Structures are given as C-alpha cells and as structure tokens.
Amino acid sequence: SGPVPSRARVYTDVNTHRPREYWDYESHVVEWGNQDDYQLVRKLGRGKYSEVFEAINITNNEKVVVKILKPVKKKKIKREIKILENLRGGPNIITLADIVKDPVSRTPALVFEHVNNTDFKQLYQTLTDYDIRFYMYEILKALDYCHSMGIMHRDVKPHNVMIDHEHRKLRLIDWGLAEFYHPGQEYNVRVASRYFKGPELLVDYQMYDYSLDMWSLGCMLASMIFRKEPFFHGHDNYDQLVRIAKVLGTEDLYDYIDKYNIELDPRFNDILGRHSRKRWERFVHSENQHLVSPEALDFLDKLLRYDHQSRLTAREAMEHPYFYTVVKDQ
Amino acid sequence: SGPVPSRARVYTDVNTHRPREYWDYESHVVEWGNQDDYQLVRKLGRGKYSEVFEAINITNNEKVVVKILKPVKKKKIKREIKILENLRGGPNIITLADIVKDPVSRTPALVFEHVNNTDFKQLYQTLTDYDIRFYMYEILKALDYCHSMGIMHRDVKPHNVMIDHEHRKLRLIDWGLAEFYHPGQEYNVRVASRYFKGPELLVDYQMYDYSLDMWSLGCMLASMIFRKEPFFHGHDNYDQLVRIAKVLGTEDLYDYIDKYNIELDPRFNDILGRHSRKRWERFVHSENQHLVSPEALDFLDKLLRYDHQSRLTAREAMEHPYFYTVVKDQ
Ligand SMILES: O=C1CCc2c(oc3cc(Br)c(O)c(Br)c23)/C1=C/Nc1ccccc1
Numbered sequence: 238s239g240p241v242p243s244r245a246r247v248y249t250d251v252n253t254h255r256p257r258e259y260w261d262y263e264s265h266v267v268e269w270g271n272q273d274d275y276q277l278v279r280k281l282g283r284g285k286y287s288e289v290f291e292a293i294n295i296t297n298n299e300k301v302v303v304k305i306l307k308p309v310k311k312k313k314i315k316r317e318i319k320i321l322e323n324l325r326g327g328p329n330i331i332t333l334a335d336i337v338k339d340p341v342s343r344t345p346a347l348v349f350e351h352v353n354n355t356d357f358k359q360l361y362q363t364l365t366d367y368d369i370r371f372y373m374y375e376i377l378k379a380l381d382y383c384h385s386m387g388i389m390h391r392d393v394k395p396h397n398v399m400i401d402h403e404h405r406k407l408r409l410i411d412w413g414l415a416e417f418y419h420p421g422q423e424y425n426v427r428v429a430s431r432y433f434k435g436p437e438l439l440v441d442y443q444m445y446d447y448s449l450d451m452w453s454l455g456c457m458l459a460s461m462i463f464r465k466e467p468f469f470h471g472h473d474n475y476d477q478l479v480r481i482a483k484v485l486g487t488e489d490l491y492d493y494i495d496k497y498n499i500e501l502d503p504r505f506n507d508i509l510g511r512h513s514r515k516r517w518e519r520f521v522h523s524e525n526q527h528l529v530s531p532e533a534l535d536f537l538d539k540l541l542r543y544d545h546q547s548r549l550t551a552r553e554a555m556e557h558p559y560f561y562t563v564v565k566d567q
Numbered sequence: 568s569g570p571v572p573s574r575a576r577v578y579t580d581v582n583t584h585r586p587r588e589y590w591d592y593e594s595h596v597v598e599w600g601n602q603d604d605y606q607l608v609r610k611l612g613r614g615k616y617s618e619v620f621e622a623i624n625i626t627n628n629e630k631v632v633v634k635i636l637k638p639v640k641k642k643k644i645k646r647e648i649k650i651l652e653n654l655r656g657g658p659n660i661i662t663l664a665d666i667v668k669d670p671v672s673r674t675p676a677l678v679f680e681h682v683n684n685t686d687f688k689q690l691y692q693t694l695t696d697y698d699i700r701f702y703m704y705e706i707l708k709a710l711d712y713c714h715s716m717g718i719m720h721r722d723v724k725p726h727n728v729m730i731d732h733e734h735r736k737l738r739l740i741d742w743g744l745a746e747f748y749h750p751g752q753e754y755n756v757r758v759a760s761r762y763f764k765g766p767e768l769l770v771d772y773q774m775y776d777y778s779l780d781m782w783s784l785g786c787m788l789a790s791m792i793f794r795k796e797p798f799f800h801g802h803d804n805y806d807q808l809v810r811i812a813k814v815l816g817t818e819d820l821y822d823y824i825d826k827y828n829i830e831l832d833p834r835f836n837d838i839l840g841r842h843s844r845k846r847w848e849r850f851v852h853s854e855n856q857h858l859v860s861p862e863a864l865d866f867l868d869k870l871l872r873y874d875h876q877s878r879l880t881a882r883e884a885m886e887h888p889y890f891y892t893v894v895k896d897q
C-alpha cells in the first residue's frame with residue numbers, strides 16, 4: 238500500500254506563500270566578494286564537507302571565520318548560501334558576513350562572524366542546572382525562528398552549537414544539511430549525526446519535517462542532565478535504533494511503524510526484540526542528580542517520541558515549566 | 568497619487584526623431600553569416616547568459632571571439648543585436664563582426680573583434696593615478712556616444728570593461744541588458760549587478776534614464792581610487808541601499824523619495840534608520856592616498872547622487888578638472 242503521508246503540524250505552508258526565489262536556491266546567483274580582504278591565521282577544525290579557519294578582515298582588523306568548502310555539488314553550496322541569507326539576523330543564528338572564492342581550492346569559502354567557542358567536551362561537565370535551561374532556551378529560539386522561516390536544520394548536535402560562555406552567547410552553526418520544508422516532499426534520511434538521528438531516519442520514513450530537529454534536541458538535553466554524551470551511543474544505524482528501543486520500549490516503536498505503514502528492514506527483526514519502556518529514574522545517580530528534576534524529565538519525555546507528530550514544537554517547548562526561571566530572568 | 572514622472576535632461580527625444588526600425592528591435596531581421604567560417608580554439612569564460620570562446624576566422628586567419636548565447640527569449644537577442652549594430656564604429660564600443668546560428672543546435676553565436684584583456688583584479692592593483700583618469704575618460708567617451716544614440720547600457724561594471732593595457736585600448740562590452748531610452752517609458756528595475764544598482768533601481772522607480780549608467784561609473788571610480796572592491800558591499804538588494812545610506816546619508820534619500828512620490832517597500836523601514844552624510848576622507852588610507860585627490864573626490868561626489876537628475880551627464884563628466892591632464896595629452 239505504501240507509507241502513510243505526513244505533514245508538519247506547524248509552519249506547513251510557509252514556503253508555498255513565499256516568492257519562488259526564496260526556496261528555489263538552484264536559481265540563486267552568488268555575489269562574490271574580495272578574497273584578498275581576509276588573511277588566514279590558523280586552522281580551527283576539519284569536517285567532511287569543509288575546513289574551518291580563523292582569519293582577519295584586514296579592512297577593519299576584525300576576527301572572522303572562513304569555512305573553505307570541500308568539493309561538493311554546487312546545488313548543495315547554493316542551498317547553504319541561500320538558507321544562511323534567509324536566516325540572517327535571526328536570533329542565535331550564525332551570521333554569514335561574506336562569500337569569497339579561495340585561491341588554492343578555487344572553491345566557495347563562507348566568511349562568518351567569530352564566536353569564541355568553549356569546547357563542549359570541557360563545557361558540558363561544568364554546566365549547572367540553570368546553565369542547561371538557559372542554553373536550551375537559546376537553541377529553541379534559533380530552532381523556532383528557522384522553522385517559522387520554513388527551514389529545518391537536520392544536523393542539531395553539541396558540535397554545531399557554538400557557545401561563548403563568558404558572555405552567555407550562543408550561535409547555531411553548520412547549515413550544510415539544512416533544507417526547506419515543503420508539504421509532501423520526501424527527503425534524504427541519511428542526514429544529521431548517527432547519535433542524533435531521529436527514529437524516522439533510522440526506519441527510513443522520508444516524509445519528515447521540522448520535528449526531526451526536536452528529537453536531536455532531546456538527545457542533547459539527555460546528554461547534559463544525565464552526564465552521558467552521547468546518550469544513545471550506537472555503533473551503526475541499526476544498533477542506534479536498538480539503543481533507543483532499550484529506553485523508549487518496542488511497543489511504541491511498532492505502533493509508530495504500524496501507524497505510518499513503514500516496512501522495516503528485516504535486519505531489525507533479529508536485533509530489536511521486546512523491550513519495556515524504561516523510567517528516567519534508571520539513569521539518575523549521585524553525579525547527575527543536581528541536573529535532573531521533574532521539570533527536566535517531563536520536558537525530555539515530551540521530546541523523545543517515536544511519532545514525529547507527537548513531539549513538542551519549538552514554540553511549545555519554550556512555554557514549558559522547565560524554562561520558567563529562564564523566562565522571568567530574561 | 569502615484570510616482571512623479573521623469574525625463575532625461577539630455578538626449579531625451581533622440582529615438583523619437585529616428586525611423587521606427589532604429590529602435591523597434593522586435594521587427595528586426597537577423598542577418599546570419601556562415602557558421603563554418605569560424606573554428607573554436609578554446610573557452611574563455613562562462614556567464615549566466617552566454618559562453619565566450621576564442622575562435623579563428625578561417626577565411627582570413629583572424630583571431631575573433633565567439634559568444635554562444637544561452638537560451639533566452641529571441642526578443643532579447645534581437646535587442647542586443649540591434650543595439651550592437653546601431654553602435655558599431657563608435658568610440659570604445661565593441662565591434663560585432665558577425666552573427667551565426669549552429670546548423671544542429673540552432674543556437675545564436677555572436678562574433679566580436681578580439682581584445683587581449685588584462686584581468687581587472689590584476690590590472691587595477693597596478694594602475695597609477697593617471698591610468699585611472701585615462702581609462703575613466705575612455706569609458707565616458709563610450710557612454711556619451713551610446714547615450715547620444717538613445718541607448719543606456721544598464722550594466723556598467725569592471726567585468727564589462729575590456730582593457731588592453733599594452734596598447735592603451737578599452738572596449739565596453741556585454742550589451743545584453745542595454746535598452747533604448749523612450750520618454751515616459753517604465754523599465755525593469757531588475758538590471759545590473761547588486762553592487763552597481765542605482766538607488767532608483769533599489770527603491771523601484773521604473774522611469775529612469777541614462778543617468779543610471781553614471782551611478783555605476785561612480786561605483787567603479789570609488790572602487791579604483793579607494794582600493795575597495797566592491798565599494799557598496801551589500802548582502803541583498805535591501806541591504807545594498809542601506810550600505811549606500813550609510814555613506815550618502817538618509818536625509819538626501821528621503822528627500823529623493825518625497826520628490827518623486829516613491830512609496831518605499833515597508834521592509835526598508837526597520838533597516839534604513841538615520842545616517843549622516845559621511846566625508847570621503849573616511850575611506851582614504853596609506854594604500855590608496857596616491858590615487859585620491861581633491862579632483863577625484865569632487866568628481867566622485869557629483870556622480871554618486873540619489874537624485875538621478877542631479878548626476879553629471881557623460882559630457883559634463885568629461886569636462887571635469889579631473890580629466891584636465893588627460894585632455895591636454897590627447
Ligand atoms: O566561531 C566560529 C564561527 C562559526 C563557525 C565555526 O565553526 C564552524 C563550522 C561550520 Br561546518 C560552520 O558552518 C560554521 Br558557520 C562554523 C566557529 C568556530 N570557532 C571557534 C572554534 C574553536 C575555538 C574557538 C572558536
């Protein structure tokens with residue numbers, strides 16, 4: 238019969254009511270800048286699609302960040318450029334300062350505002366209960382904005398959340414996997430990091446929406462309050478769903494499979510088995526108890542759901558009793 | 568009430584006194600040549616509307632340049648062909664040698680005289696103060712001629728100015744966006760490059776004239792004397808006007824808007840703000856001081872005006888004290 242279609246529960250037809258050039262990124266003309274305005278200082282890291290350097294804008298002695306793109310299809314480059322321009326000025330969204338062509342790579346190199354990042358492998362172990370709520374609220378402001386703009390990030394993870402802890406500043410980065418949401422469109426399920434892949438990606442349900450980003454957020458929240466990064470630490474795509482099934486149970490998983498008439502890879506038969514839905518108190522101990530609370534568990538439970546339709550929206554999440562103390566201080 | 572109409576203050580009724588077939592390019596019959604007379608040697612570049620090749624005319628072993636047109640409406644091809652033929656023989660205007668259609672592909676290919684171009688990204692950095700004045704005077708000879716012929720280029724920019732520095736030769740190219748001027752006609756504002764769009768294009772005033780080309784010339788002149796490419800470096804069409812307003816001030820901008828009763832896109836409200844008219848000394852430093860002079864700043868100021876009627880004409884510009892040394896050498 239085929240899989241049952243699905244629509245986004247919020248921001249469904251926002252892109253349809255936009256001018257074509259808003260989401261038709263293939264017809265976007267890149268306005269290149271002067272590459273000689275930036276001198277590379279040092280390399281900051283290497284990804285699979287780019288290399289990131291710290292540079293200086295010699296026109297005004299500003300610290301910038303140059304992301305030299307590894308060779309990929311120009312369609313994916315135009316997509317990232319168009320999304321960054323559409324989201325420019327949004328809350329906690331990284332700002333694209335300029336676009337230049339690199340001398341050596343002969344490749345697009347995106348220039349961004351600099352963010353003095355604190356490594357999450359060092360920051361998360363020092364986060365208090367209030368620090369987690371504050372930053373979760375800042376990520377939610379960025380996610381709610383880009384979702385309202387008809388865009389899903391599809392790669393939410395601690396590495397893609399730059400935090401300047403001294404100034405309590407946060408920027409959501411790495412929009413190379415972001416995509417415009419269109420009702421009824423079937424997307425590539427091989428997106429995001431394996432630890433943050435939603436169940437819809439693991440069971441290959443291609444008609445997903447913004448709710449994919451909310452699952453990844455729950456994975457981040459679980460890692461921070463339980464002091465286990467990553468929380469679902471799987472070896473592959475199949476074992477990733479098994480790690481999830483050992484916590485959320487298998488009864489809800491097969492209900493999610495029966496609801497959307499998803500056909501399972503037969504490999505999942507011999508590895509999934511039967512598992513009960515575990516209570517979050519199982520993962521609470523003396524080292525993380527100061528970060529776990531009834532608010533945190535209720536908020537986490539409303540994010541980690543098999544059914545992507547039943548997850549909280551970014552705006553609904555911002556109105557949870559978990560962020561009450563954050564909102565009044567803001 | 569609607570926007571206030573405007574006429575060109577020079578060369579207003581030149582096309583009206585011409586025979587219809589001079590400007591009625593829709594009724595122009597193309598004189599095709601023999602496609603077998605040209606053999607392509609190598610590709611020189613790719614644009615959005617064409618591909619440029621170096622070829623040889625096997626009838627006389629002449630180096631030529633073949634511009635194979637990408638698929639566009641044949642009305643626009645007739646327009647470009649008609650303008651090039653009307654302007655053939657004019658000072659510093661590229662010469663259309665022949666027009667051919669491929670037998671199999673049926674695709675237009677324009678044949679031009681060859682010009683050994685020096686890349687402006689390598690040439691401009693080696694230009695002296697006198698070199699800039701000399702070539703600016705050569706561009707003005709081409710603009711004054713085509714304006715007197717009732718044609719506006721609508722895409723003046725360094726990429727469209729071929730320079731053979733060894734022979735002190737200059738040719739204005741790429742007439743695909745050029746159009747005949749007719750009093751009272753409203754034109755498409757979606758022309759030229761983002762960095763060289765005049766204010767009338769950014770506020771959507773369709774009854775513009777030759778003075779649009781003069782604004783683009785000021786943008787070129789500013790980039791060359793200040794060593795800043797692009798000078799008005801905007802992220803989009805809206806931010807482009809904001810970058811202009813941060814230099815020319817907002818007081819003159821709203822006066823220009825109130826004079827012609829232009830209604831602004833409400834998006835401009837939250838981004839324009841209030842800005843003072845900056846002095847040109849702000850962009851002068853040790854690397855460009857040998858190119859900046861009281862004449863250059865006075866000439867640039869008389870070109871970059873919001874009010875298109877108050878900008879210098881091409882002939883008025885040629886009679887500026889900036890080109891005094893150039894004229895006596897002629
Ligand atoms: O500060 C920035 C700006 C944005 C950005 C950075 O890395 C990226 C990787 C990708 Br992929 C991407 O799309 C973006 Br945007 C960015 C980044 C890193 N800073 C840093 C790192 C280590 C120590 C101190 C500072």
Ligand SMILES: O=C1CCc2c(oc3cc(Br)c(O)c(Br)c23)/C1=C\Nc1ccccc1
Nearest residue numbers: 611614619632679680681682683684740741
């Ligand atoms: O001699 C000509 C004839 C006119 C013309 C030329 O390039 C164009 C590109 C476009 Br787009 C266009 O519309 C036109 Br007309 C032209 C050109 C020479 N270019 C060159 C020379 C050396 C290296 C690289 C490029």
